Amino acid sequence: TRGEVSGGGKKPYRQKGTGRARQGSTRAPQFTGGGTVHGPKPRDYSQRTPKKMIAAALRGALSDRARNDRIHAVTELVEGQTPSTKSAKTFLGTLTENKKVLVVIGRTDEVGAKSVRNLPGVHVISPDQLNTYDVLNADDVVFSVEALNAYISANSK
Amino acid sequence: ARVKRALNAQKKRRTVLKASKGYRGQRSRLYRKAKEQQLHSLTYAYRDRRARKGEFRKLWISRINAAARANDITYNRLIQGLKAAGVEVDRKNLAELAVSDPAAFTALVDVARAALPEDVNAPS
Amino acid sequence: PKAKTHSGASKRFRRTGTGKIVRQKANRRHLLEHKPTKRTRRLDGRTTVSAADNSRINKLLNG
Amino acid sequence: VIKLHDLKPAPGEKKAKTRVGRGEGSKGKTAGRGTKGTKARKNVPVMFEGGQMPIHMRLPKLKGFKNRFRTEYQVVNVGDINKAFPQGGTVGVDELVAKGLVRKNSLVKVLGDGKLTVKVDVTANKFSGSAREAITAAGGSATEL
RNA sequence: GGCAGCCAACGUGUUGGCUGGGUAGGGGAGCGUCCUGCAUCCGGUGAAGCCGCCGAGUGAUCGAGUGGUGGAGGGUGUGG
RNA sequence: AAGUCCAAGAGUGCGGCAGUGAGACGGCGGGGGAUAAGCUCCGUGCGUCGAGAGGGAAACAGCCCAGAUCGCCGGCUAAG
RNA sequence: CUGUGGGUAGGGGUGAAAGGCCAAUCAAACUCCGUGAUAGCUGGUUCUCCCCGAAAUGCAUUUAGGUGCAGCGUCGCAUG
RNA sequence: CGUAGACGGUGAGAGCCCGGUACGUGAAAACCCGACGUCUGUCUUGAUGGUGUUCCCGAGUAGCAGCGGGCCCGUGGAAUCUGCUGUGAAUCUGCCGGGACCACCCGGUAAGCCUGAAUACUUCCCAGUGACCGAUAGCGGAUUAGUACCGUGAGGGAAUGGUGAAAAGUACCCCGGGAGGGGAGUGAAAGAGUACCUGAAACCGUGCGCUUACAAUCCGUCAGAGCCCUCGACGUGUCGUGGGGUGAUGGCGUGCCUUUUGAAGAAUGAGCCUGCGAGUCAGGGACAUGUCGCGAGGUUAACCCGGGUGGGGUAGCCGCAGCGAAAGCGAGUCUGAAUAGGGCGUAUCCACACAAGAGUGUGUGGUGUAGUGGUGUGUUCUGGACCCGAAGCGGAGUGA
RNA sequence: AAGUGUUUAAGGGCGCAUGGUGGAUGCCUUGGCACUGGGAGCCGAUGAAGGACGUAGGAGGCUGCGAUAAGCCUCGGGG
Ligand SMILES: [Mg+2]
Ligand SMILES: [Mg+2]
Ligand SMILES: [Mg+2]
Ligand SMILES: [Mg+2]
Ligand SMILES: [Mg+2]
Ligand SMILES: [Mg+2]
Ligand SMILES: [Mg+2]
Ligand SMILES: [Mg+2]
Ligand SMILES: [Mg+2]
Ligand SMILES: [Mg+2]
Ligand SMILES: [Mg+2]
Ligand SMILES: [Mg+2]
Ligand SMILES: [Mg+2]
Ligand SMILES: [Mg+2]
Ligand SMILES: [Mg+2]
Ligand SMILES: [Mg+2]
Ligand SMILES: [Mg+2]
Ligand SMILES: [Mg+2]
Ligand SMILES: [Mg+2]
Ligand SMILES: [Mg+2]
Ligand SMILES: [Mg+2]
Ligand SMILES: [Mg+2]
Ligand SMILES: [Mg+2]
Ligand SMILES: [Mg+2]
Ligand SMILES: [Mg+2]
Ligand SMILES: [Mg+2]
Ligand SMILES: [Mg+2]
Ligand SMILES: [Mg+2]
Ligand SMILES: [Mg+2]
Ligand SMILES: [Mg+2]
Ligand SMILES: [Mg+2]
Ligand SMILES: [Mg+2]
Ligand SMILES: [Mg+2]
Ligand SMILES: [Mg+2]
Ligand SMILES: [Mg+2]
Ligand SMILES: [Mg+2]
Ligand SMILES: [Mg+2]
Ligand SMILES: [Mg+2]
Ligand SMILES: [Mg+2]
Ligand SMILES: [Mg+2]
Ligand SMILES: [Mg+2]
Ligand SMILES: [Mg+2]
Ligand SMILES: [Mg+2]
Ligand SMILES: [Mg+2]
Ligand SMILES: [Mg+2]
Ligand SMILES: [Mg+2]
Ligand SMILES: [Mg+2]
Ligand SMILES: [Mg+2]
Ligand SMILES: [Mg+2]
Ligand SMILES: [Mg+2]
Ligand SMILES: [Mg+2]
Ligand SMILES: [Mg+2]
Ligand SMILES: [Mg+2]
Ligand SMILES: [Mg+2]
Ligand SMILES: [Mg+2]
Ligand SMILES: [Mg+2]
Ligand SMILES: [Mg+2]
Ligand SMILES: [Mg+2]
Ligand SMILES: [Mg+2]
Ligand SMILES: [Mg+2]
Ligand SMILES: [Mg+2]
Ligand SMILES: [Mg+2]
Ligand SMILES: [Mg+2]
Ligand SMILES: [Mg+2]
Ligand SMILES: [Mg+2]
Ligand SMILES: [Mg+2]
Ligand SMILES: [Mg+2]
Ligand SMILES: [Mg+2]
Ligand SMILES: [Mg+2]
Ligand SMILES: [Mg+2]
Ligand SMILES: [Mg+2]
Ligand SMILES: [Mg+2]
Ligand SMILES: [Mg+2]
Ligand SMILES: [Mg+2]
Ligand SMILES: [Mg+2]
Ligand SMILES: [Mg+2]
Ligand SMILES: [Mg+2]
Ligand SMILES: [Mg+2]
Ligand SMILES: [Mg+2]
Ligand SMILES: [Mg+2]
Ligand SMILES: [Mg+2]
Ligand SMILES: [Mg+2]
Ligand SMILES: [Mg+2]
Ligand SMILES: [Mg+2]
Ligand SMILES: [Mg+2]
Ligand SMILES: [Mg+2]
Ligand SMILES: [Mg+2]
Ligand SMILES: [Mg+2]
Ligand SMILES: [Mg+2]
Ligand SMILES: [Mg+2]
Ligand SMILES: [Mg+2]
Ligand SMILES: [Mg+2]
Ligand SMILES: [Mg+2]
Ligand SMILES: [Mg+2]
Ligand SMILES: [Mg+2]
Ligand SMILES: [Mg+2]
């Protein structure tokens, strides 16, 4: 702003008699190099929607995917002990033809998330982290048995 | 998100300057003086578009009066007689008759005089 | 920052159960001997504040 | 299958901001302020009246005091016991909090407004005379804490 | 003959009737600029910018109509 | 008691957002002044200007006519 | 009279006194900071169109070119 | 190919061309960490609960007073804490506090000292990110930048980026003293030539078309002859649903903005162009109105667990009963001696009765009562708060 | 004889075509701005922070260094 830019303390010249506009400092907004008037300052943009709004949006998006048969459960992405983007890609291709998929996996299952992480349209998220934005991106949502059961059980009571 | 206001600013400038072609002086060169002139130009165009219908009626009346007086009748009596006769041609085409073919104008003056009171100054 | 209630107005104005703002009539604190009791008793109790002043009093009360 | 571009605010939700002082087509050269004065550049405080004695200074302060030792009670009317308890039974403070008839940690007094018909055993900090008569004339009993 | 605001009738988009000068000021609906989520499209067979031609819209303005110059990024939809 | 009544876009009540609180001349009733002022101060379901374009008064905010939605190379009128 | 070296500093200095002088400035020097001082005062405030549309009065005022409330505009609701 | 489709560069949009990325591997020395020993210290010529008195328990202190400071508390009835001055005790059936004070009860044990964690910040280093700026912006400083420069001095304080992919940066010839150019070459391009990407406007020329030297012009607008260009048709120059350019001539015509009762005004402001320059943001702020979720309920704050925007978190807050100064009472309550009027309150409506037409009341039934939390908009409060502008006031310094 | 009637451009205006000047616009960037996560939270008589003058085979500026002067030794890395 006007007071944060360097310099500007002096009145530039005498206030009367010079035949020029009355100017209070060289860092005034109308000056080149002067202060910005209503300019951006850092902002926190988060807004806190009620919990059940968020939960309902989750359920509505997941229902929207379910009505159209876009939810899949699988035992796991790839046979374990080692990641393999090739085989996991082939299996996921059998499972769906669309471009974007959510792959909801439990956090412990690292071999599975490693083997599907480098596919261009594939987004990997944890069941306890499920939100409406990622499921609305996905054309299909591909759960694991453990992750589907976990989401069901976190909302069964 | 800072914007450089020059893409949008130049559009009305080009519009007004293109409209101000032919203006003598700096009223065809500078956007501000050209805009000041465009204000007057469009008000004057409105004014004269409204008054053109009166200027042309003035011209038609003048031509009709001259032709009528050539036919030895006054303009006002001529149109009074044409109103009395039911012939309901407007002054525009009555002026085209006065100019283009004077024989039909002569005949129409004959009709107007035939359909006129035996005393135009009678108390009726 | 949270808004501040105008303290001088809170100790003068009050709200009823429905929400109308009541008042206390003036000219009754001293110099009472020459005032008849009819004037004295038409000047006490509460009375609802005027509709003209209801807009500013509300802003002073809520801050 | 709703995707992120299919999302739209509800009709009537979002109103356009009124950007002011952006030309004479809408609100220009004064931004809705009119000509000069105090109000043309700053404001006027809400407790200002032009130097005459303000509304908050020519009126007496309300009589009385506040009594910091006030005992306030959260009140239930007897008619709500009918709705809350279709059969009656024992009804204390905390199994009356669960029915959302009073706040959780407060003193509870029972008042006799509605009409009570069921056999109830009410326990509360205090009772009304009408409430006590309604409780005991309907067949139940009422004990204070 | 064209438009628009209020209202009415059948009825569910028309028709009809009234009305449409305007500063301070109030309300409503929009044009153009930039950044972005998502979706699509165009571009070294030449993007933007600029200069024109020929046009268009009730207004801000438009030209996924066209040429010249130019040399790497843009359009449109729906939200922010 | 009627009239207007697909309108006055009228009253009244509550609320959101106001601007205004320097007015001018002309007609009629008056105070001040010298029954002076293009003076000053009041009254007027008086007007116009302010905030009013168009026609008349040579020119000429406030006088007379008449209230501009746009177009027309139609007609009838008002003051004059 | 003059050179060289030095001393007096801001409500302070110095003045054979003119409010003179104290770095082209002096009824309280200059620089930076408080600080974007405060101004009932002047100036400026940026695209469009649609509908409606004032006031220049009353009352109070350390008041009279400022403001509060009333009157008079607009929008929403109620009544009709 | 992918545990690597991060991001750059390379002659234009590259996962497979380069550096890298995912993922692993590596430290002689120095430093920071732990861990095990020497080492260091203490405890054991010794433990435990009893039964009955004298002494001790932080002294120029507490307390008291005068004058102050600070507490929500501006001297107030003014406690608690505290400075200067004066006076000045007790060692536990003591002394201090519990908002003057006293009594009783309760809590504690001043005038001795150490103390980790949870908390605040970033000169500097490392690694990242941005609905951040993009050369009048962003730091004053993308380039000599606290530089040049201005001042005696404290101090003030600039302006200056872009050839091409690659210098391949124009050999040689010609005019010229050179500068500059013209051929020739380089290059995809020289409308890229180290005055170099794009190259707008103001401003300045040159060429052509129409016009203009008897004429009183806010410089336009409407009508308009003549000339010039262009598109069609018939044909071979004259019309046409035409289009442009210029305009002899005729009618009408008092710039823009501010501010004013009223300005073309001889009131203000503006030489011109290009770039810049003014209602913004924060807050469980307040009021109102949209919209959404849940609904007699609604919602969490700090915080905790999540490489995320997700999930837990009931403390509080608002609604749920009012009247009263208050004790209090409670669909009532206050006033009052009053079943005697009035005030406020009992969502709202419907009916049936019982009383008066002094404005309707009272009562029995029924219907049953709407809030809250996100978020858009308007206004508002606290903040520089729409932007610009004093003369001057204060603090610390610099100057004879 | 009376009457009528084109052609002037010293210079100026407007439209176009062509350039100059100028450095906007577009598209950029060895620069900044706001933060996030770590580290380290002091240096100095064993002479600090910061400088002056010197220093390369050749003139200056920035950087590095100090008469052992774009450097000297030892240990690692790497090529
Ligand atoms: Mg400053
Ligand atoms: Mg001057
Ligand atoms: Mg100042
Ligand atoms: Mg800046
Ligand atoms: Mg949460
Ligand atoms: Mg012309
Ligand atoms: Mg208070
Ligand atoms: Mg008294
Ligand atoms: Mg008395
Ligand atoms: Mg906002
Ligand atoms: Mg305006
Ligand atoms: Mg303006
Ligand atoms: Mg306003
Ligand atoms: Mg102004
Ligand atoms: Mg005024
Ligand atoms: Mg005002
Ligand atoms: Mg205040
Ligand atoms: Mg209609
Ligand atoms: Mg209108
Ligand atoms: Mg009209
Ligand atoms: Mg307006
Ligand atoms: Mg665009
Ligand atoms: Mg978009
Ligand atoms: Mg493509
Ligand atoms: Mg090419
Ligand atoms: Mg762009
Ligand atoms: Mg081309
Ligand atoms: Mg192009
Ligand atoms: Mg938008
Ligand atoms: Mg009528
Ligand atoms: Mg009407
Ligand atoms: Mg009305
Ligand atoms: Mg006044
Ligand atoms: Mg007045
Ligand atoms: Mg008057
Ligand atoms: Mg007068
Ligand atoms: Mg008179
Ligand atoms: Mg008089
Ligand atoms: Mg007069
Ligand atoms: Mg009068
Ligand atoms: Mg006015
Ligand atoms: Mg008029
Ligand atoms: Mg009028
Ligand atoms: Mg008359
Ligand atoms: Mg007639
Ligand atoms: Mg007449
Ligand atoms: Mg001497
Ligand atoms: Mg000296
Ligand atoms: Mg002196
Ligand atoms: Mg000086
Ligand atoms: Mg001097
Ligand atoms: Mg001084
Ligand atoms: Mg002074
Ligand atoms: Mg301050
Ligand atoms: Mg100011
Ligand atoms: Mg109107
Ligand atoms: Mg006073
Ligand atoms: Mg007012
Ligand atoms: Mg209103
Ligand atoms: Mg890449
Ligand atoms: Mg002790
Ligand atoms: Mg004190
Ligand atoms: Mg005290
Ligand atoms: Mg300590
Ligand atoms: Mg800069
Ligand atoms: Mg540039
Ligand atoms: Mg600068
Ligand atoms: Mg110097
Ligand atoms: Mg070649
Ligand atoms: Mg090229
Ligand atoms: Mg150049
Ligand atoms: Mg160039
Ligand atoms: Mg001539
Ligand atoms: Mg004349
Ligand atoms: Mg003319
Ligand atoms: Mg004229
Ligand atoms: Mg003035
Ligand atoms: Mg004025
Ligand atoms: Mg005047
Ligand atoms: Mg002037
Ligand atoms: Mg003049
Ligand atoms: Mg003036
Ligand atoms: Mg001037
Ligand atoms: Mg500027
Ligand atoms: Mg806010
Ligand atoms: Mg109360
Ligand atoms: Mg009494
Ligand atoms: Mg009562
Ligand atoms: Mg709701
Ligand atoms: Mg809201
Ligand atoms: Mg000072
Ligand atoms: Mg000195
Ligand atoms: Mg010529
Ligand atoms: Mg230390
Ligand atoms: Mg050096
Ligand atoms: Mg080695």
mmCIF file of N, CA, C and O (backbone and C1' of nucleotides) in Angstrom, chain C residues 1-3 14 16-20 46 48 62-63, chain H residues 282-283 285-287 322-325 344-346 382:
data_model
loop_
_atom_site.group_PDB
_atom_site.id
_atom_site.type_symbol
_atom_site.label_atom_id
_atom_site.label_comp_id
_atom_site.label_asym_id
_atom_site.label_seq_id
_atom_site.Cartn_x
_atom_site.Cartn_y
_atom_site.Cartn_z
ATOM 1 N N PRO C 1 -13.216 -7.377 14.135
ATOM 2 C CA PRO C 1 -13.484 -7.441 15.570
ATOM 3 C C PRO C 1 -14.966 -7.444 15.883
ATOM 4 O O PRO C 1 -15.736 -6.867 15.128
ATOM 5 N N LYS C 2 -15.359 -8.090 16.976
ATOM 6 C CA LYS C 2 -16.766 -8.158 17.332
ATOM 7 C C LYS C 2 -17.302 -6.774 17.665
ATOM 8 O O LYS C 2 -16.605 -5.930 18.226
ATOM 9 N N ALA C 3 -18.559 -6.551 17.302
ATOM 10 C CA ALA C 3 -19.180 -5.251 17.479
ATOM 11 C C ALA C 3 -19.388 -4.957 18.954
ATOM 12 O O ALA C 3 -19.514 -5.862 19.778
ATOM 13 N N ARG C 14 -34.857 -1.189 26.651
ATOM 14 C CA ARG C 14 -35.112 -2.566 27.029
ATOM 15 C C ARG C 14 -36.113 -3.162 26.056
ATOM 16 O O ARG C 14 -36.914 -2.447 25.459
ATOM 17 N N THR C 16 -39.167 -6.158 25.236
ATOM 18 C CA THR C 16 -40.214 -6.948 25.856
ATOM 19 C C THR C 16 -40.149 -8.385 25.346
ATOM 20 O O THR C 16 -39.195 -8.793 24.683
ATOM 21 N N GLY C 17 -41.167 -9.179 25.670
ATOM 22 C CA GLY C 17 -41.171 -10.567 25.248
ATOM 23 C C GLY C 17 -41.303 -10.726 23.750
ATOM 24 O O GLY C 17 -40.670 -11.598 23.154
ATOM 25 N N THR C 18 -42.135 -9.899 23.120
ATOM 26 C CA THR C 18 -42.286 -9.975 21.672
ATOM 27 C C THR C 18 -41.109 -9.333 20.954
ATOM 28 O O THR C 18 -40.706 -9.792 19.881
ATOM 29 N N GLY C 19 -40.555 -8.268 21.511
ATOM 30 C CA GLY C 19 -39.393 -7.656 20.909
ATOM 31 C C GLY C 19 -39.519 -6.168 20.687
ATOM 32 O O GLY C 19 -38.691 -5.580 19.992
ATOM 33 N N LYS C 20 -40.547 -5.543 21.243
ATOM 34 C CA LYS C 20 -40.623 -4.098 21.149
ATOM 35 C C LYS C 20 -39.779 -3.468 22.245
ATOM 36 O O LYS C 20 -39.599 -4.036 23.320
ATOM 37 N N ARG C 46 -43.094 2.371 31.713
ATOM 38 C CA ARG C 46 -42.466 2.349 30.408
ATOM 39 C C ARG C 46 -43.438 2.805 29.325
ATOM 40 O O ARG C 46 -44.653 2.842 29.511
ATOM 41 N N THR C 48 -43.406 2.519 24.776
ATOM 42 C CA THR C 48 -42.658 2.026 23.630
ATOM 43 C C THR C 48 -42.023 3.190 22.877
ATOM 44 O O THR C 48 -42.619 4.259 22.747
ATOM 45 N N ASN C 62 -27.932 -3.158 19.450
ATOM 46 C CA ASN C 62 -27.189 -4.300 18.929
ATOM 47 C C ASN C 62 -25.730 -3.973 18.667
ATOM 48 O O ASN C 62 -24.913 -4.892 18.557
ATOM 49 N N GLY C 63 -25.385 -2.696 18.574
ATOM 50 C CA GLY C 63 -24.021 -2.297 18.308
ATOM 51 C C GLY C 63 -23.635 -2.464 16.854
ATOM 52 O O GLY C 63 -24.394 -3.017 16.063
ATOM 53 P P A H 282 -12.125 -11.032 3.038
ATOM 54 O "O5'" A H 282 -11.633 -10.779 4.521
ATOM 55 C "C5'" A H 282 -10.353 -11.214 4.941
ATOM 56 C "C4'" A H 282 -10.124 -10.872 6.389
ATOM 57 C "C3'" A H 282 -11.278 -11.183 7.318
ATOM 58 O "O3'" A H 282 -11.310 -12.540 7.713
ATOM 59 C "C1'" A H 282 -10.502 -9.004 7.741
ATOM 60 P P G H 283 -12.714 -13.302 7.814
ATOM 61 O "O5'" G H 283 -12.953 -13.452 9.378
ATOM 62 C "C5'" G H 283 -11.940 -13.084 10.305
ATOM 63 C "C4'" G H 283 -12.499 -12.301 11.466
ATOM 64 C "C3'" G H 283 -13.822 -12.822 12.020
ATOM 65 O "O3'" G H 283 -13.807 -12.779 13.445
ATOM 66 C "C1'" G H 283 -14.037 -10.535 11.423
ATOM 67 P P G H 285 -18.847 -13.628 11.890
ATOM 68 O "O5'" G H 285 -18.753 -12.477 12.983
ATOM 69 C "C5'" G H 285 -19.890 -12.122 13.745
ATOM 70 C "C4'" G H 285 -19.652 -10.892 14.574
ATOM 71 C "C3'" G H 285 -20.806 -9.909 14.593
ATOM 72 O "O3'" G H 285 -21.806 -10.254 15.526
ATOM 73 C "C1'" G H 285 -18.840 -8.755 14.077
ATOM 74 P P A H 286 -23.190 -10.878 15.021
ATOM 75 O "O5'" A H 286 -24.141 -9.625 14.884
ATOM 76 C "C5'" A H 286 -24.250 -8.663 15.913
ATOM 77 C "C4'" A H 286 -24.899 -7.413 15.390
ATOM 78 C "C3'" A H 286 -26.106 -7.630 14.496
ATOM 79 O "O3'" A H 286 -27.299 -7.827 15.224
ATOM 80 C "C1'" A H 286 -24.640 -6.091 13.485
ATOM 81 P P C H 287 -28.419 -8.828 14.678
ATOM 82 O "O5'" C H 287 -29.118 -7.995 13.533
ATOM 83 C "C5'" C H 287 -29.798 -6.794 13.843
ATOM 84 C "C4'" C H 287 -30.208 -6.066 12.600
ATOM 85 C "C3'" C H 287 -30.939 -6.875 11.553
ATOM 86 O "O3'" C H 287 -32.289 -7.136 11.882
ATOM 87 C "C1'" C H 287 -29.323 -5.526 10.516
ATOM 88 P P G H 322 -38.967 -15.189 27.686
ATOM 89 O "O5'" G H 322 -39.979 -14.005 27.989
ATOM 90 C "C5'" G H 322 -41.323 -14.076 27.545
ATOM 91 C "C4'" G H 322 -42.299 -13.768 28.649
ATOM 92 C "C3'" G H 322 -41.964 -12.585 29.527
ATOM 93 O "O3'" G H 322 -42.275 -11.356 28.905
ATOM 94 C "C1'" G H 322 -42.679 -14.387 30.869
ATOM 95 P P C H 323 -41.574 -10.000 29.379
ATOM 96 O "O5'" C H 323 -42.195 -9.750 30.812
ATOM 97 C "C5'" C H 323 -43.565 -9.422 30.944
ATOM 98 C "C4'" C H 323 -43.970 -9.309 32.387
ATOM 99 C "C3'" C H 323 -43.130 -8.390 33.238
ATOM 100 O "O3'" C H 323 -43.442 -7.031 33.050
ATOM 101 C "C1'" C H 323 -43.483 -10.402 34.390
ATOM 102 P P G H 324 -42.301 -5.927 33.209
ATOM 103 O "O5'" G H 324 -41.774 -6.128 34.690
ATOM 104 C "C5'" G H 324 -42.471 -5.561 35.781
ATOM 105 C "C4'" G H 324 -41.883 -5.984 37.099
ATOM 106 C "C3'" G H 324 -40.485 -5.509 37.419
ATOM 107 O "O3'" G H 324 -40.390 -4.137 37.740
ATOM 108 C "C1'" G H 324 -40.730 -7.753 38.079
ATOM 109 P P A H 325 -39.471 -3.184 36.837
ATOM 110 O "O5'" A H 325 -38.195 -2.882 37.727
ATOM 111 C "C5'" A H 325 -36.893 -2.954 37.165
ATOM 112 C "C4'" A H 325 -35.843 -3.145 38.228
ATOM 113 C "C3'" A H 325 -35.768 -4.525 38.852
ATOM 114 O "O3'" A H 325 -34.922 -5.381 38.103
ATOM 115 C "C1'" A H 325 -35.754 -2.851 40.542
ATOM 116 P P C H 344 -48.442 -2.595 26.917
ATOM 117 O "O5'" C H 344 -47.400 -3.795 26.819
ATOM 118 C "C5'" C H 344 -46.017 -3.599 27.068
ATOM 119 C "C4'" C H 344 -45.396 -4.771 27.789
ATOM 120 C "C3'" C H 344 -45.649 -6.149 27.204
ATOM 121 O "O3'" C H 344 -44.867 -6.439 26.066
ATOM 122 C "C1'" C H 344 -45.932 -6.232 29.536
ATOM 123 P P G H 345 -45.464 -7.375 24.918
ATOM 124 O "O5'" G H 345 -45.655 -8.781 25.626
ATOM 125 C "C5'" G H 345 -44.574 -9.680 25.785
ATOM 126 C "C4'" G H 345 -44.968 -10.888 26.592
ATOM 127 C "C3'" G H 345 -45.987 -11.814 25.968
ATOM 128 O "O3'" G H 345 -45.467 -12.658 24.959
ATOM 129 C "C1'" G H 345 -46.586 -11.427 28.191
ATOM 130 P P U H 346 -46.417 -13.108 23.751
ATOM 131 O "O5'" U H 346 -47.300 -14.276 24.370
ATOM 132 C "C5'" U H 346 -46.705 -15.452 24.893
ATOM 133 C "C4'" U H 346 -47.660 -16.207 25.782
ATOM 134 C "C3'" U H 346 -48.817 -16.897 25.091
ATOM 135 O "O3'" U H 346 -48.467 -18.145 24.525
ATOM 136 C "C1'" U H 346 -49.619 -15.708 26.959
ATOM 137 P P U H 382 -16.781 2.939 14.210
ATOM 138 O "O5'" U H 382 -15.693 1.799 14.399
ATOM 139 C "C5'" U H 382 -15.411 1.248 15.671
ATOM 140 C "C4'" U H 382 -14.209 0.351 15.596
ATOM 141 C "C3'" U H 382 -13.059 0.897 14.779
ATOM 142 O "O3'" U H 382 -12.275 1.819 15.505
ATOM 143 C "C1'" U H 382 -13.467 -1.342 14.157
#
